[model samples]
Target chain A: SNAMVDKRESYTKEDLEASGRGELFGAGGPPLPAGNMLMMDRIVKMIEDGGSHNKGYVEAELDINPDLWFFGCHFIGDPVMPGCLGLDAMWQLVGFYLGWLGGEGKGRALGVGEVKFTGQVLPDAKKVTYRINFKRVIMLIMGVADGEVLVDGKVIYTATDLKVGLFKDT
Target chain B: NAMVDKRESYTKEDLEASGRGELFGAGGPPLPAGNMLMMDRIVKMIEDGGSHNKGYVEAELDINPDLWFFGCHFIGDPVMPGCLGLDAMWQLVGFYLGWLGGEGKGRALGVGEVKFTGQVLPDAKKVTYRINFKRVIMRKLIMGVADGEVLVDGKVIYTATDLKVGLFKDT
Candidate 1:
């Protein structure tokens, strides 16, 4: 059973920025993406209890349209959203999750244990949703979560052991 | 062991003529070679390579210290997005399929384990991408599954397995 019970939802871009929690470039730049690279538009819902593992979960949403930057350059005659960027969105949300947890150090995307892309996100699609359920979290050292990507209510991606880690530079 | 028996290569200046991309199909524009061209050069490509002994491609993308993404990707912290790394592999997987006669527009299907153990920043030199096909199906359409890796210098920082790509003629 999954519910928003004991949850902290409604995180917008302004909210994420105001919280000062996101990935760091370690190059004297802001912790979040300065360009279209910022994947998620909002953290729609989050919970202390939910997900396949029953530990907890984080939910985020990204609107999809033909005007999105990549749609312009991914391909000419045939433009289907590059699945990896969709994958990056999940990592971006996971990165955001670690920052929300008050973890320390510059953020770097760690890895994914496994991922399967069953479908594509076309230009006509309305929205994309990201969900992360904490699996085994070691705080800032390493954070692992199971997740999925949905396109307008249809599950398009299934992933496991999605990881994001924070590390201190010497 | 997989070895390249036949090989071809394209240099940076060669790809630069098109502004870092090549046209794959009919159309005036709306294509990939525009700004999304991630690989700078194809250093080596062979007809026989990888675990399946099908084929392989080794490519490179030079990182400009002041690329647009660095200035705009983040207000302060600037780093090359790792997803682009994976996209780079997609670039080659499709290329290999076509270079070997798998016709039609390409679409990335799926991928296996992907690791990001390193970061590419403004000061870095260049990034190398290598993809070795593990299987291929020229049936009805062409499909290739590969094992790939990305390197910043001489060390592997990003690795992926079973990177799937398929080609279809249908719009």
Candidate 2:
């Protein structure tokens, strides 16, 4: 069946008062809460289609798996990106290279632990940098490190004296 | 002139029908938008007191020095215990004495940076944590060091460096 598609007009006050489907609820369901996603699309499109700060990467998604999950876990906010996630990823990255430095078993932070959050890492904020200070290796081949995340030289978030243990499956 | 407080009771129906303050917007002012302070208090009390989190901590006055000039400073909701502070200091003690020994200064992890992000009042929570850390080492000195970007809620607040610099005693 070829149903003809026709454009509709904005609902008038009469439409709102009338005993029609739209009149039942102030607004209809399905799209009740979230304002149209098209709005974000337009903004994003504007940026992508040569909006300012369109450094190609400017149109990048700030809510990537790494950052989002990390902060989400720590704060436990509605859309938290956990602090541990960032630390975890850092551990993984360092592990990729420095895992050999740690012992051949599991490593844990059996020492001092420190974490500082400066800003509410929301779903925005495009850039985030981490400054890590790897202290030493011990009997467990594990080490400690201090780190900070800076948004353009301004430290937006930081952590210190955090314990780190690295272990490998023997 | 002193005004006497008047107490009155009304049924839900009477209140609705009265509509006493509806037209002129005379209804009482709205509560703090998020009312986070209240909710935070409830959470802390229930979790720590009602539950078994043991000795817990909350947040207290988390404000910046510069903002005080304009009186537009970060106001604490109530006053959370400085447990985090106590903990941080304790950790510092371990670091200073090498109890939590680092392989060496440069070879181990230390409190790189810290800042008070927010405050939780005592009424809001039974305990509070005013933890501290360092963000950037602006300059190293003989006794201690100058640092940068230690803040609460993204505002420049506390600043420190290595444990030696942080726990250094003034001569």
Candidate 3:
């Protein structure tokens, strides 16, 4: 079970601006991965948990546009959101945490555990929020995080204890 | 755990004899040339009991050099998105489900545990996947539990397990 963050709280400009800079991946532009148009629209808000364990919590907005390329190729008639992309959104959130900690190398997804999708994300659906919590980190190189995808303030999907490892090419 | 269907089991040699034809009756779109993560077709290796329990399926796909996703995943550094890798495996899983009375009657419901060991780099091409169905249940609705792995030159790059698929009724 995860402690759901308070969504009603306001975010400071610093929090908003840090996410905008997209410096999490490396000494480059965009903290998260690009290539997928559906992924770029995501916005993450860094939140304070009032602790000293180096634990990080961030909120994300899943802005799924119908005109994206995936919808055209995923399924002809039934175009529901792919569950993997939802997980990708969470990975991006974790990537932000790594960047926030000044991790220099690229982050690699080691594995995912206990992920479940309770409902279907229709093509017309909008306004989905992903709440990701990084429970533990070591040297900002490896850590574990828990994520939840919420719609209308209801938890629709969850990713439990996802593991991430970092590396840089030689 | 379930027993393997020896009668329906087929090997690489068996697949070679069958010839390479398009897979999935509900074909979506033609894959771009040299596209990575696109499966040519699924060869049913083994089937368990009725309802296709513990079925084993395999696919051979080439990682295209001119993949479109490479452009968006990163501006200069491009790698195949993990999501697309999972999507290709699900497409094969959907085919197996359809063969067992689920064609046009089911959709991908959820996944359990997935692990990525390596990245699908831009230059890397050609991969083989093995989908192993652990269990299948069909009481109220049809559901299949399975696991899959992506292999490049015989090395395991990614793995997904405890995957669950829910089959709908009366599309």
Q: Evaluated with TM-score, which candidate comes out highest?
A: 1
lDDT of 2 by residue, B1-171 (tens): 121232122232322222232211232111111201111111111111111222111233223222211111102111221222322332222222211111111101233443333333222212222222222122221111112222234343333333322212111
Candidate 3 ranges beyond 4 A from true positions: A1-30, A35-44, A48-54, B1-37, B49-53, B103-105
Q: Which stretches of candidate 1 lie over 4 Å from their true place?
A: A1-8, A17-30, B1-7, B11-31, B50-52, B72-74
lDDT of 3 by residue, A86-153 (tens): 77778766755665555555556677787887776666667678887878776637768888887657
Worst 10 residues of 2 chain B by lDDT: B30-39
Q: Better model by lDDT, 2 or 3?
A: 3
Task: Go through the candidates in order and give each one's DockQ.
Answer: 0.50, 0.02, 0.32
> Model 3, residue A61: displacement in angstroms?
0.6
In order, the candidates keep a fraction of the true contacts of: 0.78, 0.01, 0.52
Kindly list the per-residue Cα lDDT of model 1 for residues B1-171, writing each as its tens digit.
122343388765654443323432231112155557787789988887755688889998888886666764545567788888888887688877766655677777778889988888888888999898888887766788899999997789899988887777764
**Could you tally the backbone clashes for each prediction?**
13, 46, 11
Which of 2 and 3 is ahead in DockQ? 3
**What TM-score fits each model?**
0.86, 0.30, 0.77
Model 3, B37-128: lDDT tens digits are 26654444556532335687777756676778767565456777776677667655655665554434345566777878777777777777
lDDT (Cα, 0-100) at B7 in candidate 3: 34
Runs off by more than 4 Å, candidate 2: A1-80, A91-97, A100-103, A107-112, A168-170, B1-171
Q: Could you tell which candidate, 1 or 3, scores higher by lDDT?
A: 1
